[PDB]
C-alpha cells in the first residue's frame, strides 16, 4: 500500500541536495559568527541579532527534517504526531519571526531617519528587548493555528496501512483556504508594503544626500558608504520580495486548486517547485549575514578577524 510517491529524476534530487547543503553550511557559519560578534545604537544591533537568530533557528530546525522527510523518505512522517505539530509550529513561528523582524527593521530605519526624536523615544534597550520578546511571542501565537489545523492522516488504499500515513492539514478546504490565505495576506502583503515604501523613501533621502555630497571640500573617501547604503537598502527589499514571494505563491496554489484542476504534470511541477521554494527561503535566511557583511567592510573586518 505505497502510493502518492512522486518519481523524480535522481540527478535533480542530488543537485538540490547539494544546494541545500551549501546553503546549510553558509547560513550556519554566517549566523553563528554574526551572533557571536553582536554578542561580544544598541536597538538596531538587537534587531539584526534577532533576525539572524530567527534565520539560524529556521535553518537548524527546518532544514534537516525537511531534507530527510521530503527528499529521501517522501511519504512517511519520521517524527510522529507531535513531530508534525512541532515542525509546522516552529517553521511558521520562524516565518512570522523573520517577516516581523524585517518589518521592524524597516520601520526602525524609516523612524531613524525621518523621525529622529520619535525614534529616540520609541527606542530603548529595555523596550527593545521587551519588543523582540513580544514579537517572538506573537510569532508563537500566530503559529498556534499551525498547531490545531495540521496533523496526521492515513491516505492509503483503505486508510489502515501504517505506511500510508502522511502529514497534512486535516481540515476541509474552505477553512484551510481562509487560514492559509490570511497568513499569506498579512505576513507577506504587509511586509512588502512597509519594506517597499519605507525603504523607497529612505533611498530618496539617501540619493538626495548623495547629490548633495557631489560638500566635496568636507568629504574624505566616504561616498562609497553612501552608495553601499543604497545598495544594501535595495538588496534588503529585493531579497525579501524574491525570496518570500514563490513560497507563498506555492501555498496559494495549494490553497485554491480543489483537485479538479490538478494533473500529473502540475503534480510534478508542484513537488519540484516545493524544493525550489525551500531553496529560496534558505537563500534568504543565509544571505542576510552576507549582505550585512559585505557592505560594512569594517564590521566585515571584525568578522574575519574573529574568525582567523
Amino acid at each position: 500500500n505505497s502510493d502518492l510517491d512522486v518519481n523524480t529524476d535522481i540527478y535533480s534530487k542530488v543537485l538540490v541536495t547539494a544546494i541545500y547543503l551549501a546553503l546549510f553550511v553558509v547560513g550556519t557559519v554566517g549566523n553563528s559568527v554574526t551572533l557571536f560578534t553582536l554578542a561580544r545604537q544598541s536597538t538596531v544591533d538587537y534587531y539584526l541579532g534577532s533576525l539572524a537568530l530567527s534565520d539560524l533557528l529556521i535553518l537548524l530546525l527546518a532544514m534537516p527534517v525537511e531534507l530527510y522527510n521530503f527528499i529521501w523518505v517522501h511519504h512517511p512522517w519520521a517524527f510522529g504526531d507531535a513531530g508534525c505539530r512541532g515542525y509546522y509550529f516552529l517553521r511558521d513561528a520562524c516565518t512570522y519571526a523573520t517577516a516581523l523582524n524585517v518589518v521592524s527593521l524597516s520601520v526602525e530605519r524609516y523612524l531613524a531617519i525621518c523621525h529622529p526624536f520619535k525614534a529616540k523615544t520609541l527606542m530603548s534597550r529595555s523596550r527593545t528587548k521587551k519588543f523582540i520578546s513580544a514579537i517572538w511571542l506573537a510569532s508563537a501565537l500566530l503559529a498556534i493555528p499551525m498547531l490545531f489545523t495540521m496533523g496526521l492522516q492515513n491516505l492509503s488504499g483503505d486508510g489502515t496501512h501504517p505506511g500510508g500515513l502522511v502529514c497534512t492539514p486535516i481540515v476541509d478546504t474552505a477553512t484551510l483556504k481562509v487560514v492559509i490565505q490570511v497568513n499569506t495576506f498579512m505576513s507577506f502583503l504587509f511586509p512588502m508594503l512597509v519594506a517597499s515604501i519605507l525603504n523607497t523613501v529612505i533611498a530618496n533621502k539617501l540619493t538626495v544626500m548623495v547629490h548633495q555630497a557631489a560638500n566635496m571640500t568636507i568629504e574624505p573617501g566616504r561616498v562609497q558608504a553612501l552608495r553601499r547604503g543604497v545598495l544594501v537598502l535595495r538588496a534588503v527589499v529585493i531579497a525579501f520580495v524574491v525570496c518570500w514571494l514563490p513560497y507563498h505563491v506555492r501555498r496559494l496554489m495549494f490553497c485554491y486548486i480543489s483537485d479538479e484542476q490538478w494533473t500529473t504534470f502540475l503534480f510534478d511541477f508542484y513537488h519540484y517547485f516545493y524544493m525550489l521554494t525551500n531553496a529560496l527561503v534558505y537563500v534568504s535566511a543565509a544571505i542576510n549575514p552576507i549582505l550585512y557583511n559585505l557592505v560594512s567592510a569594517n564590521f566585515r573586518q571584525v568578522f574575519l578577524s574573529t574568525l582567523a
Binding site: 512522486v6 501555498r251 500529473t264 508542484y270 513537488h271 516545493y274
Partner: peptide, 6 residues
C-alpha cells in the same frame, strides 16, 4: 491526485 505536501 492531490499532493498532501505543505
Amino acid at each position: 491526485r492531490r499532493p498532501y505536501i505543505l
